[PDB]
Amino acid sequence: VTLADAGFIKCAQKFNGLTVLPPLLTDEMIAQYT
Amino acid sequence: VSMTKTSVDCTMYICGDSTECSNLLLQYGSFCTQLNRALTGIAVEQDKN
Amino acid sequence: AISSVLNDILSRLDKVEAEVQIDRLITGRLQSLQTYVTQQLIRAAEIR
Amino acid sequence: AISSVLNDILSRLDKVEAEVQIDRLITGRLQSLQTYVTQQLIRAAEIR
Amino acid sequence: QCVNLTTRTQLPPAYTNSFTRGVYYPDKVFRSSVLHSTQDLFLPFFSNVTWFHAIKRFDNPVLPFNDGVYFASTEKSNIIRGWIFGTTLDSKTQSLLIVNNATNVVIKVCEFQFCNDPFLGVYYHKNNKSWMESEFRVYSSANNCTFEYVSQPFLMDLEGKQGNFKNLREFVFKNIDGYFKIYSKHTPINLVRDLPQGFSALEPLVDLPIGINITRFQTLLALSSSGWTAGAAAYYVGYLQPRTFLLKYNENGTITDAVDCA
Amino acid sequence: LDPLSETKCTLKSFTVEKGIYQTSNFRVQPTESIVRFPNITNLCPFGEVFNATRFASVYAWNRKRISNCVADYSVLYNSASFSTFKCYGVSPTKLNDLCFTNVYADSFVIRGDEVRQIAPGQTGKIADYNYKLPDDFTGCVIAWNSNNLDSKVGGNYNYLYRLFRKSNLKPFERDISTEIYQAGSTPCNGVEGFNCYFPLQSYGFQPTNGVGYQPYRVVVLSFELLHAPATVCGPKKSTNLVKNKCVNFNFNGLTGTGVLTESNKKFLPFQQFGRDIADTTDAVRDPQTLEILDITPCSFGGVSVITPGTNTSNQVAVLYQGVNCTEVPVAYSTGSNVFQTRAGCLIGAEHVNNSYECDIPIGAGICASYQT
Amino acid sequence: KNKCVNFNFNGLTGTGVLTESNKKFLPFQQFGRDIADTTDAVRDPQTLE
Amino acid sequence: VFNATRFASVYAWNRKRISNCVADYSVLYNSASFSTFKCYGVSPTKLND
Amino acid sequence: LCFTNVYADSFVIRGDEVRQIAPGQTGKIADYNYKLPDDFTGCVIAWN
Numbered sequence: 001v002t003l004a005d006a007g008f009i010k011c012a013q014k015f016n017g018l019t020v021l022p023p024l025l026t027d028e029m030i031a032q033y034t
Numbered sequence: 035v036s037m038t039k040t041s042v043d044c045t046m047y048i049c050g051d052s053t054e055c056s057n058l059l060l061q062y063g064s065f066c067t068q069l070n071r072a073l074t075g076i077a078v079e080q081d082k083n
Numbered sequence: 084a085i086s087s088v089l090n091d092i093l094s095r096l097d098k099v100e101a102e103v104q105i106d107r108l109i110t111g112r113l114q115s116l117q118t119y120v121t122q123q124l125i126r127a128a129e130i131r
Numbered sequence: 132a133i134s135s136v137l138n139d140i141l142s143r144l145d146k147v148e149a150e151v152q153i154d155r156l157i158t159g160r161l162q163s164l165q166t167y168v169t170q171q172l173i174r175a176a177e178i179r
Numbered sequence: 180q181c182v183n184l185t186t187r188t189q190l191p192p193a194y195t196n197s198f199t200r201g202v203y204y205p206d207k208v209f210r211s212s213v214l215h216s217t218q219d220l221f222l223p224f225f226s227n228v229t230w231f232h233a234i235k236r237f238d239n240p241v242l243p244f245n246d247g248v249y250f251a252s253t254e255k256s257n258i259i260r261g262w263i264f265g266t267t268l269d270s271k272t273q274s275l276l277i278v279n280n281a282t283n284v285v286i287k288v289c290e291f292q293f294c295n296d297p298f299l300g301v302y303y304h305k306n307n308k309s310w311m312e313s314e315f316r317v318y319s320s321a322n323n324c325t326f327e328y329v330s331q332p333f334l335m336d337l338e339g340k341q342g343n344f345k346n347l348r349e350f351v352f353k354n355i356d357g358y359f360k361i362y363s364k365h366t367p368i369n370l371v372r373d374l375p376q377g378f379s380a381l382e383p384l385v386d387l388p389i390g391i392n393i394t395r396f397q398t399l400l401a402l403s404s405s406g407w408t409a410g411a412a413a414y415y416v417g418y419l420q421p422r423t424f425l426l427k428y429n430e431n432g433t434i435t436d437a438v439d440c441a
Numbered sequence: 442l443d444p445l446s447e448t449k450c451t452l453k454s455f456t457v458e459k460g461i462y463q464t465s466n467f468r469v470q471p472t473e474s475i476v477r478f479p480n481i482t483n484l485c486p487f488g489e490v491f492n493a494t495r496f497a498s499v500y501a502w503n504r505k506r507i508s509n510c511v512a513d514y515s516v517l518y519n520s521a522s523f524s525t526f527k528c529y530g531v532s533p534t535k536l537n538d539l540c541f542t543n544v545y546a547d548s549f550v551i552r553g554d555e556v557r558q559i560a561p562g563q564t565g566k567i568a569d570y571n572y573k574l575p576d577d578f579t580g581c582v583i584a585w586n587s588n589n590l591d592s593k594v595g596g597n598y599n600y601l602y603r604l605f606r607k608s609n610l611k612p613f614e615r616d617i618s619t620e621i622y623q624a625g626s627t628p629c630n631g632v633e634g635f636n637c638y639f640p641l642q643s644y645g646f647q648p649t650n651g652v653g654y655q656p657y658r659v660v661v662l663s664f665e666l667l668h669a670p671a672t673v674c675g676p677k678k679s680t681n682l683v684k685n686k687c688v689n690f691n692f693n694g695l696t697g698t699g700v701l702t703e704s705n706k707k708f709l710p711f712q713q714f715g716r717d718i719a720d721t722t723d724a725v726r727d728p729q730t731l732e733i734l735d736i737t738p739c740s741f742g743g744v745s746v747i748t749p750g751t752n753t754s755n756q757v758a759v760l761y762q763g764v765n766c767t768e769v770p771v772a773y774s775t776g777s778n779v780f781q782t783r784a785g786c787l788i789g790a791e792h793v794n795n796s797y798e799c800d801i802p803i804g805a806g807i808c809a810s811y812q813t
Numbered sequence: 814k815n816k817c818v819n820f821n822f823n824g825l826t827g828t829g830v831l832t833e834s835n836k837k838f839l840p841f842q843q844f845g846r847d848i849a850d851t852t853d854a855v856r857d858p859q860t861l862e
Numbered sequence: 863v864f865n866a867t868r869f870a871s872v873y874a875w876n877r878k879r880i881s882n883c884v885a886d887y888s889v890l891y892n893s894a895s896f897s898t899f900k901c902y903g904v905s906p907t908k909l910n911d
Numbered sequence: 912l913c914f915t916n917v918y919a920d921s922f923v924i925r926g927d928e929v930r931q932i933a934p935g936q937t938g939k940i941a942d943y944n945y946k947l948p949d950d951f952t953g954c955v956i957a958w959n
């Protein structure tokens with residue numbers, strides 16, 4: 001599964017007031033629950 | 035289970051780097067806030083899911 | 084509008100002419116956000 | 132607009148007067164389709 | 180000077196397939212790793228292009244110019260040297276002259292009184308063991324001029340090369356709101372008598388705000404006054420159409436492939 | 442006053458519950474303006490536009506284009522030869538201080554009773570039938586005596602006006618027509634007819650004529666301002682290329698706001714403005730020193746306020762979402778308690794090593810709480 | 814009739830296929846309308862079918 | 863209509879019915895004698911169509 | 912209707928300059944000696 005603009009401190013989306021926010025549980029915290 | 039969380043500066047999307055457009059955008063009232071609430075309610079429930 | 088670029092309209096026209104052109108873009112854009120947020124609120128309910 | 136019938140605008144007005152009428156019908160009829168597709172996208176989730 | 184050159188064999192108007200040739204950069208805007216979609220006056224893909232010869236034969240007619248024109252020549256010995264564009268072609272209105280005389284390329288807009296059969300002509304290896312330009316029979320007069328360009332002086336060869344074609348030269352001409360826009364390309368070839376199957380993009384090399392009506396065009400070739408040898412060249416004319424094109428820019432931002440969306 | 446006052450103002454309540462609240466977006470302001478244009482040299486064609494051999498007739502007035510040139514009006518305004526020098530959309534002093542998208546010279550000759558009809562909003566046989574200026578005409582009208590240039594002692598009848606027409610012409614129309622005017626009710630076929638007039642008449646311009654009855658050569662400089670990528674400019678403005686700072690930029694007429702940076706993208710020699718997947722301008726060529734600049738709009742994000750309930754405390758922390766701490770100092774700037782998170786910079790909250798149950802969720806594994 | 818055409822009846826421009834109706838228009842009417850307010854029948858002005 | 867010798871007093875404006883005839887409006891619109899020709903439900907160029 | 916306060920701005924100008932008295936205009940009356948705001952509420956009156 002591919003991804004885009006995941007929210008980590010790093011164009012077309014960002015440049016226009018659009019933002020993507022990170023999940024609360026990181027993919028490590030998800031894997032500790034799993 | 036989830037999707038990407040998004041939030042938008044509705045004033046920067048409609049009127050990014052213009053004050054004349056931002057002063058006209060006030061003629062519409064609540065819509066940019068109501069839109070921010072919607073996307074915040076979507077985003078807050080991705081963590082709930 | 085005479086352009087989609089907001090800063091161009093603000094140089095091609097004076098205030099009482101530009102307000103008509105800028106309001107086309109405020110109307111259309113705001114309908115684009117209202118549509119995206121409708122699509123996303125419907126989508127988010129499939130993901131829930 | 133001066134008519135609900137699109138060809139009756141174009142039978143009476145030239146390009147510069149017609150586009151002020153046709154655009155109303157575009158604006159209202161595209162709001163009608165977005166309303167229908169919103170109602171159908173909401174409905175489809177009742178049936179799913 | 181002004182003359183009618185009647186010593187020709189009659190051949191039918193030939194046709195060939197313009198495979199994926201005739202795309203041009205539609206704007207001066209950089210793009211890369213993207214499949215950009217645009218509607219403009221492009222040459223339709225895989226369409227029949229009208230084919231002309233110089234050989235025995237010296238095909239040079241006045242042609243329509245409607246929504247702009249694709250022109251291409253597969254060439255040796257630099258035989259295609261110019262074009263005429265305009266609406267009356269007889270100094271009742273202005274017209275555009277493009278010429279490549281052996282010294283340097285000239286572009287001009289004037290009330291040109293063009294000849295009925297216009298041409299350039301060269302003395303073929305006359306004792307001097309050089310090919311020498313001598314006949315410049317295109318216009319009798321030029322009244323109200325309002326644009327002139329001449330390139331920096333040089334020395335292009337008129338040399339009578341022999342063999343198959345080695346130069347391909349592609350051009351698109353558009354006359355929009357008074358802006359006469361030339362897109363063109365050059366690429367090396369090794370072909371007998373047909374337009375090569377391959378993809379090419381035309382860069383905009385010059386734009387002129389000439390402000391005239393163009394309804395037609397004619398092409399100028401290098402030839403005591405009748406009975407002569409034409410150095411051999413093939414050329415092709417296509418008419419552009421409004422057609423949505425999808426354009427693949429590669430990493431280095433160069434249109435690398437295209438799709439004609441109909 | 443403070444982020445808590447902004448949350449009270451956001452929520453329209455004088456007391457705020459425990460949580461993390463979105464508030465008005467952070468956005469770096471530009472440091473300065475910058476104009477980057479192609480190097481200019483040669484002067485505009487004034488020695489053609491005003492000192493040409495012969496001029497147009499007013500019935501079919503000339504339009505000459507002014508393009509790829511340096512514009513100077515100080516020669517035109519200081520020269521005592523011109524009896525009229527009037528500007529209808531700019532001040533006549535400011536002409537050197539100003540840049541133009543495209544420019545033209547409407548060039549012709551007229552009689553002094555009719556020079557008044559060249560101004561916008563007029564009527565009479567020149568204004569009605571051959572030269573109408575538009576209501577919003579922006580540009581200038583310039584006129585001078587030419588009896589020493591254009592006249593012959595019999596009257597130089599080479600200069601023609603229009604005297605009849607089917608309608609008053611539309612602004613900037615040029616009418617070439619010579620077809621006969623049907624003055625009576627009957628039609629007219631062929632070259633001539635009874636009680637018809639030919640629609641043109643020439644002027645009686647002689648070197649003995651009194652002032653105002655002399656040929657005046659008129660140039661009307663129509664120009665249009667700022668609204669598009671420009672092809673005429675004054676002898677002045679392009680300014681030094683700053684980099685790595687937020688600026689109000691202008692490249693060839695492409696106005697915007699952003700950070701500028703040296704690009705590793707290559708542009709082929711005919712390409713000027715570089716775009717993204719969404720057709721937004723992501724790069725541009727500097728038109729002087731030919732190098733490619735990355736464009737980025739100046740750093741911005743959501744500003745989220747972490748608060749305990751107002752009933753607990755007025756202390757708050759602030760999250761700059763998806764923004765590197767190094768960029769915040771631009772604007773709590775004290776810090777000594779700042780924290781970069783994957784979610785963005787965190788200010789006013791003290792980072793703790795101890796892992797606790799998530800109280801107020803910040804993002805990317807981080808949470809915050811009010812504790813000793 | 815029975816072909817696609819760009820019609821015009823008394824300035825009622827359009828595009829469509831014309832066929833002989835069995836709708837019986839009372840004398841005062843030149844046109845019949847649809848639910849969408851578009852004309853779906855017309856009385857020819859020279860032969861009054 | 864346009865070339866009658868006496869017109870009406872405006873309190874008693876006269877109304878002629880135009881019927882059973884072909885109306886070449888291009889004649890009036892192309893006549894320079896009319897200082898005003900303002901149409902309110904059609905453009906003047908369209909009147910022949 | 913009623914008004915909270917009323918002011919009659921009284922002056923002489925050339926007949927070409929009456930158009931400049933309207934809101935959102937430019938030219939030497941509108942620019943240098945008498946400007947109305949873009950939202951002007953009131954009436955402009957002129958007589959020869």
Ligand SMILES: *C1O[C@H](CO)[C@@H](O[C@@H]2O[C@H](CO)[C@@H](O)[C@H](O)[C@H]2NC(C)=O)[C@H](O)[C@H]1NC(C)=O
Pocket residue numbers: 480728729730
């Ligand atoms: C415009 O002029 C300038 C010089 O006046 C040219 O820029 C110079 O380029 C060299 C090589 O990069 C630098 O060492 C100089 O310092 C530059 N001078 C200035 C003033 O920038 C520039 O090449 C000219 N424009 C074009 C298109 O060539």
Ligand SMILES: *[C@@H]1O[C@H](CO)[C@@H](O[C@@H]2O[C@H](CO)[C@@H](O)[C@H](O)[C@H]2NC(C)=O)[C@H](O)[C@H]1NC(C)=O
Pocket residue numbers: 009010765766767781
């Ligand atoms: C915030 O920006 C700074 C740059 O100002 C980043 O620091 C760089 O990090 C890399 C990787 O460790 C180093 O190779 C650079 O030399 C650093 N430069 C400087 C000046 O700090 C920092 O990583 C960024 N932080 C985040 C979270 O994106």
Ligand SMILES: *[C@@H]1O[C@H](CO)[C@@H](O[C@@H]2O[C@H](CO)[C@@H](O)[C@H](O)[C@H]2NC(C)=O)[C@H](O)[C@H]1NC(C)=O
Pocket residue numbers: 266267392393394
């Ligand atoms: C541009 O020139 C063309 C050709 O001269 C004009 O079209 C001609 O118009 C006349 C008059 O109706 C016809 O008799 C010719 O047969 C037409 N020829 C062609 C090839 O079109 C055209 O009208 C001109 N355009 C403008 C804007 O003046």
Ligand SMILES: *[C@@H]1O[C@H](CO)[C@@H](O[C@@H]2O[C@H](CO)[C@@H](O)[C@H](O)[C@H]2NC(C)=O)[C@H](O)[C@H]1NC(C)=O
Pocket residue numbers: 280281282283285312329
């Ligand atoms: C190619 O064409 C140009 C343009 O017609 C010729 O240039 C002229 O040359 C003569 C003789 O040197 C000059 O007196 C003219 O003033 C030139 N005119 C222009 C506009 O350049 C040129 O001579 C031609 N070359 C050849 C070899 O015939």
Ligand SMILES: *[C@@H]1O[C@H](CO)[C@@H](O[C@@H]2O[C@H](CO)[C@@H](O)[C@H](O)[C@H]2NC(C)=O)[C@H](O)[C@H]1NC(C)=O
Pocket residue numbers: 429430431
């Ligand atoms: C873009 O152009 C560059 C330069 O022409 C290409 O990079 C060259 O690739 C060849 C073949 O591998 C090497 O021999 C050269 O040394 C490279 N140039 C340099 C200076 O590094 C590059 O391949 C092109 N990109 C694409 C996608 O075609």
Ligand SMILES: *[C@@H]1O[C@H](CO)[C@@H](O[C@@H]2O[C@H](CO)[C@@H](O)[C@H](O)[C@H]2NC(C)=O)[C@H](O)[C@H]1NC(C)=O
Pocket residue numbers: 858859860
């Ligand atoms: C159109 O023309 C037709 C004749 O060409 C007119 O119809 C005729 O009406 C008379 C009286 O009923 C009949 O005797 C004829 O047989 C009809 N004509 C034909 C062709 O059969 C008709 O009146 C005309 N249109 C209008 C509106 O008057």
Ligand SMILES: *[C@H]1O[C@H](CO)[C@@H](O[C@@H]2O[C@H](CO)[C@@H](O)[C@H](O)[C@H]2NC(C)=O)[C@H](O)[C@H]1NC(C)=O
Pocket residue numbers: 270271322323496497503
């Ligand atoms: C440039 O010169 C030509 C020729 O002198 C002018 O063409 C003449 O124009 C007038 C006005 O329509 C006619 O009376 C003549 O019959 C035309 N003569 C020819 C030979 O065509 C042309 O008008 C001039 N243009 C300018 C801008 O001065």
Ligand SMILES: *[C@@H]1O[C@H](CO)[C@@H](O)[C@H](O)[C@H]1NC(C)=O
Pocket residue numbers: 194226227
């Ligand atoms: C091209 O010419 C061929 C004849 O060789 C013909 O069969 C074909 O239909 C033509 N196609 C087009 C698009 O003109």
Ligand SMILES: *[C@@H]1O[C@H](CO)[C@@H](O)[C@H](O)[C@H]1NC(C)=O
Pocket residue numbers: 486487488489490491492516520
């Ligand atoms: C035109 O010539 C006069 C002298 O005859 C000179 O003073 C003036 O500057 C010239 N103007 C232009 C635009 O060449």
Ligand SMILES: *[C@@H]1O[C@H](CO)[C@@H](O)[C@H](O)[C@H]1NC(C)=O
Pocket residue numbers: 752
């Ligand atoms: C909050 O604190 C105030 C006193 O500071 C008190 O009046 C109020 O009842 C308290 N309410 C709650 C729910 O804590």
Ligand SMILES: *[C@@H]1O[C@H](CO)[C@@H](O)[C@H](O)[C@H]1NC(C)=O
Pocket residue numbers: 792793794
């Ligand atoms: C957390 O502990 C590490 C050692 O494991 C230390 O380097 C760091 O300074 C500590 N952080 C705080 C905030 O005490």
